[PDB]
Curated annotation (Swiss-Prot), chain B:
Organism superkingdom: Bacteria
Major subcellular site: cytoplasm
NCBIfam families on file: LcrH_SycD, PRK15331.1
Family statement drawn from the similarity comment of this UniProt entry: Belongs to the LcrH/SycD chaperone family.
GO cellular component: cytoplasm
Record function comment: Assists the correct folding of nascent IpaB. Once it is bound to IpaB, it binds to IpaC and impedes their premature association that would lead to their degradation in the absence of IpcG.
Location of this chain's protein in the cell: Cytoplasm
InterPro entries for the chain: T3SS_Ca_resp_chp_LcrH/SycD, T3SS_Ca_resp_chp_LcrH/SycD_sub, TPR-3, TPR-like_helical_dom_sf
Protein name: Chaperone protein IpgC
Keyword Cytoplasm: yes
Source organism of this protein record: Shigella flexneri
GO molecular function per UniProt: identical protein binding
Length: 142, 133
């Protein structure tokens, strides 16, 4: 692991714990797999702890961010979820799935024009026709 | 950075005119070549209101000037996700990806501009990069 001075330096420098290899890679994989297990088992509170832990460890990991965003969406913290989905989109650049879920969140936030803009962005830019079918099903419902 | 601040804020939990004032001051610094002071002001603005495309775009431009190409690209992508209709961030992401030795990502950015932007001057610029790729 990392000595305390190295962890403190990372806190003070704005760096991730990932950047200083504070926990072995295999253990982080285990933690992600357990977080997914909790999620799939309906243990949302525990899944939330684990996805928060993962995102503290590496705020630039798209899948860690996507997991927490999904949990926030389930818990109806729609603005926090939308905020994380936007970050997740930016980090991956290529995948419009977070923009699709942002659209769902915006509908629940009573921002239907923002939602429409999200679904249209998916339709116009994604080459994933299966995702477009889902986005189009929201757009057609208006 | 600004992205890490946005993520940490989400993990854990001023009149528009005044914000407009500070944005203009940051631009004033930028235009005089006071890049470091402009960067502080844009970083401040992105802490106060990160999901504001004008603040993101200004900070991303400074990172691009400073050859911090990955940070710039990440911020331009946020701006595009939030704004959706302006392809200027996609165009600059393409430039950044070229400098990051990611020519296929760059090509995808410039193609998006040509296919979707209504900014004819931006489309010429994107095509000139494509011709070099
Ligand atoms: N419906 C089409 N003809 C069509 C064209 C382009 C794309 C894109 F390249 F954007 F993925 C997706 C679908
Ligand atoms: C699945 C699904 C759920 C809701 C809608 C909407 F309410 F937006 F129409 C569309 C598709
Ligand atoms: Cl120690
Ligand atoms: Cl990238
Ligand atoms: Cl709206
Ligand atoms: Cl444009
Ligand atoms: Mg056109």
């Amino acid at each position: 692991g990392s000595i305390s001075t190295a962890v403190i330096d990372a806190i003070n420098s704005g760096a991730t714990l990932k950047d200083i290899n504070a926990i072995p890679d295999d253990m982080m994989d285990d933690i992600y797999s357990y977080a997914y297990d909790f999620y799939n088992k309906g243990r949302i509170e525990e899944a939330e702890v684990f996805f928060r832990f993962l995102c503290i460890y590496d705020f630039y990991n798209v899948d860690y961010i996507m997991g927490l965003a999904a949990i926030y969406q389930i818990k109806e913290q729609f603005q926090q979820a939308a905020d994380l989905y936007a970050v997740a989109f930016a980090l991956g650049k290529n995948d419009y799935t977070p923009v699709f879920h942002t659209g769902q969140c915006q509908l629940r936030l009573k921002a239907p024009l923002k939602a429409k803009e999200c679904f249209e962005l998916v339709i116009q830019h994604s080459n994933d026709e299966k995702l477009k079918i889902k986005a189009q099903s929201y757009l057609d419902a208006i």
